[PDB]
Amino acid sequence: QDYSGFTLTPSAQSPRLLELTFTEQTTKQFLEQVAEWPVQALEYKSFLRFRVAKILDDLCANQLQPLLLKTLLNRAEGALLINAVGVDDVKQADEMVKLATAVAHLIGRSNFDAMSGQYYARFVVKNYLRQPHRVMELHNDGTYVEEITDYVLMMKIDEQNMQGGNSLLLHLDDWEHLDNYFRHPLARRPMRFAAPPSKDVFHPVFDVDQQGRPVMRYIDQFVQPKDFEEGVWLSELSDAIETSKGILSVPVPVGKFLLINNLFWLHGRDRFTPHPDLRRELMRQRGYFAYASNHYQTH
Amino acid sequence: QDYSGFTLTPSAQSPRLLELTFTEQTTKQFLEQVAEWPVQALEYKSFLRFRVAKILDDLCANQLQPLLLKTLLNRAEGALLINAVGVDDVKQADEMVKLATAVAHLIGRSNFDAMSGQYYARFVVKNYLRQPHRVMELHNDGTYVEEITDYVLMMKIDEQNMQGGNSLLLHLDDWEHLDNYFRHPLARRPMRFAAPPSKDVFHPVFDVDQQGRPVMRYIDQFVQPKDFEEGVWLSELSDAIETSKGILSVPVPVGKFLLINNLFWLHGRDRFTPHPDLRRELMRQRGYFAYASNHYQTH
Amino acid sequence: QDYSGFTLTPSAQSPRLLELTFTEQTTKQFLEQVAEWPVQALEYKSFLRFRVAKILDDLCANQLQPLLLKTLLNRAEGALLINAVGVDDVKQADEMVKLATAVAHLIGRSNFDAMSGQYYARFVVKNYLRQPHRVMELHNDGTYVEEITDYVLMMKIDEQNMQGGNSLLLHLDDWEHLDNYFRHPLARRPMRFAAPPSKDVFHPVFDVDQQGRPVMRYIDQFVQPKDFEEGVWLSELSDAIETSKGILSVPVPVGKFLLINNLFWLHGRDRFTPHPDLRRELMRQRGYFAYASNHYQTH
Amino acid sequence: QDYSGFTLTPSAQSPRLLELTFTEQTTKQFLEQVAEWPVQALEYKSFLRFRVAKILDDLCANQLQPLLLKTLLNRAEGALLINAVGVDDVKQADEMVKLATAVAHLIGRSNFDAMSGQYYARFVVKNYLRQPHRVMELHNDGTYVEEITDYVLMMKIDEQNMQGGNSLLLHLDDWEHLDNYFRHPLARRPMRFAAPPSKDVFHPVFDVDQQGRPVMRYIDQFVQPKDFEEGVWLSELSDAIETSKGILSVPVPVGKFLLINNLFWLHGRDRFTPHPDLRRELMRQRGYFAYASNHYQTH
Ligand SMILES: [Fe+2]
Ligand SMILES: [Fe+2]
Ligand SMILES: [Fe+2]
Ligand SMILES: [Fe+2]
């Protein structure tokens, strides 16, 4: 299991989460070969996101794309942590954005992001939610729209005078309370979802895949229980997730990013220590799967 | 008729309006048990409104919820005034918001409020409508949307150098002119309703419940008569309400709130005395009923 | 033809345009009887527009409403100029608004006005369109919405150091070129209409009434010809209207207003002389007809 | 091939692009005959755009309109460059706008332009896209709306301390790679298109005319490939256009404008030299064809 242009190894936290590192040579060739397109050009022309994607897959002998797809579609795995040797300082923020864009567009397409107005977003924490000193709860993304979100991506840009603040993760077949909530009649009841500042949507909190196994579509801030029966059941569901013993805690140094299957993984973030001269900065992307396979058709 | 955790007694104004007071011990236990969620957290996660609701009902031995439901659904009653010993100064505004949220979410759910952007709203009067020195006319809430609003809630936050300004109320089976307006062909004619700064709606001013008795959906500022036949009839309807001898006048001290069935009760507010150093502050919520019962179903 | 509370006489400009004047006594009784509702209250509660309407019709022994209706629906007439003795200075602007509101709501209802945000609008000219020194072209109102506008109302509020600026009017059975444009196949072709800052509408420039006679729906600023065939025909139509010999020129002193049938009359405004200390001010309303009559119905 | 009021000659760049020049006499008569309508009046009343169009065609003995139509609808030609003797300085900007409006409205109608809020737009470059020092890529206009855009118009207003910056053009039957991309199954696959700051649209990148020949609807900034199959194919399509040997390079002096068939021509712009005192200014319009012809009809 040795690949062309990168190395792949299980993480220190779980065998379901794989670490993928691009070599110093692959890194410096990719940055040379995309130096003519600044970050502003990727924002303007979306076919260029698939072009820098092909450039990176070609530099890895067309082994990157089927590997990313097999890993993200395998019920037993479904998640990755990614970096490139030599890209690791806040003064290299532009190079970091280019690298994350190429990986996403081998597996599908990244959707528009309302908070930045682009296909990605950057934000700073001092002294999503930028509230220091508290934990961010585990959730799926994309629950408040009709089309399914298949994947989520998150990258670290700067860090100064900083203690704490790791990322958190949870897989459904590691969640000890799945069968109890899935066999409840409310697991198959469609419910309402809504975000703060368009239209509301209706779907169950659980569904099944093609073989009959469970998948989830949940976040505490945006689900809207219609009555006391739904609302109590959901607050019990929230506690059963946040106190799960299956949660992973992952540091993300300046230069690295996570990428996960959004149907059977959830994610979040830990609290940190205050300091008068503290600084932290992040970047994110989200989207759907699209790929080739052999199946029936007519005419 | 002695209950666990609270006392219940008819008001000095009418036997249709009941006063419900939480003991100093229930109050201090509820504030301790919800101290980890500040008001900002209830704004962010709506299942937490049903959680603080369950916490309060459990502290009353599951006697609060069937009592609130029986009272609000009984055609003969339908209204309540509520407070908690020890919570009574403008410096305790945050504690007041928490208490009102728990009561509402035992009977149904509170709807989004466009003037504050949250599920509740706070406003100040000096020197809805903040016009001093004039009366606010009796009405139902929610007339300018399609779904029915089943209940209304209103709470007092501060008061300084203040004379006057009580709340006003009216029940349909106490209104001496009901039969005259209900048997008119215009009582069953659908009419247009519209608010100031979306879409208009069409419904009659009167309807019936399941037994055939009358209910109302009326406010003077937002109904829009289409011709001289409808417009004269409505201005006669307005005078017949504002001069009714069945109206109740209720002071609401710092710390107390009203909660009423919006289908067969109407509500309003009295005028007050000017003073250079005067100050008054309020809070409100509105929503629909949802509960369990035995009835037919298929498949 | 002597009426209770007012006098009625043909104008100096045409027998199709009648002048209606309320006596000093009717004026001072109406202003007393509506003094408890300031202009701000008519803005807030629309049934009060039909109430001040009934108050004025009652002061005229229920002769005003059938007279206004017979006049506006008669193909041979269709227009009025209205005033009240003693109301004639810029310091009485509020009294003027009250009078015009009562007349309109005996015949139908005035529609929302987007430029002021109320059911009426006021504007000032110095040194619709506030361009001094040029003529405003003849048109119908309401061409860019789906529902028909049956009437138009316009009132004068102030005037200082001012020469020129009369109102202009034209009736279709006085227009020498009607038959030529009505028998053209393009008279019955639906066309597109659009305003500057929602949705566009499609209707012919001409139609017929129930007997088969012609009516119009035209304005130069908002009709949008789709091709050279429609566009040339419309610019010829515009010249044939602006140079018509049937146009009337009407001064409107501080305190008076016009009110006309919008289906077979058009209206506009003349140019004026500049002066460093010049000032002029106006008010308008628009709406549809609604009234009782004997006709067939089922069930 | 000598015409009344203007001269017509093939350009120095291609026989598919014809140059049309109005004489000094036609120019000074047109400016006199439209001097009563300033640019502000053409903005307000759209039938006046067809009026100044008829005025110009009449000054050319009704030979301009069938010539413009025959040229733009002929698959072998389809493009023009236009000017008027004596109109050539930034102080004559208003006269330039009037001339371009008259030509467009003989062949069809110019659509609303969102960046200026009028039927045309003006913009300045210093030191669409105003980025100095880089090339603007070849494209069709109107790809992100449902109705077809048949033509495009572009005019030069000022130029100071300026080196470089010509216009660029490409005809499909001059494009060496047409057959290769047209016979691909993706040429007939409907795809999604979207602009930055309403609704998205779906159409193939290629279609056919009534005889079965190819036409195009493409721009790199607004097409949105749905997967890696579409996205790679489009980035190959972009390179095959930008490096085509069939591209024309056209200077456009102060006072001249281009006008082209948008179904089988594409267009763009070259880079230029920096200078502390540099200045350049432009104007544009776009729309659809509408004209008379002999064909079948019913009833
Ligand atoms: Fe997230
Ligand atoms: Fe209310
Ligand atoms: Fe008008
Ligand atoms: Fe363009």
PDB file of C-alpha atoms and ligand atoms in Angstrom, chain D residues 136 139-141 152 154 267 286, ligand 4:
ATOM      1  CA  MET D 136     -10.393  39.362 -21.281  1.00  0.00           C
ATOM      2  CA  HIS D 139     -17.349  34.372 -24.793  1.00  0.00           C
ATOM      3  CA  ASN D 140     -21.026  34.740 -25.740  1.00  0.00           C
ATOM      4  CA  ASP D 141     -23.247  37.124 -23.743  1.00  0.00           C
ATOM      5  CA  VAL D 152     -23.969  42.448 -28.783  1.00  0.00           C
ATOM      6  CA  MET D 154     -19.636  47.950 -27.774  1.00  0.00           C
ATOM      7  CA  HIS D 267     -15.757  38.290 -28.332  1.00  0.00           C
ATOM      8  CA  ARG D 286     -27.395  43.634 -25.861  1.00  0.00           C
TER       9      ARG D 286
HETATM   10 FE    FE E   4     -19.108  40.404 -23.358  1.00  0.00          FE
END
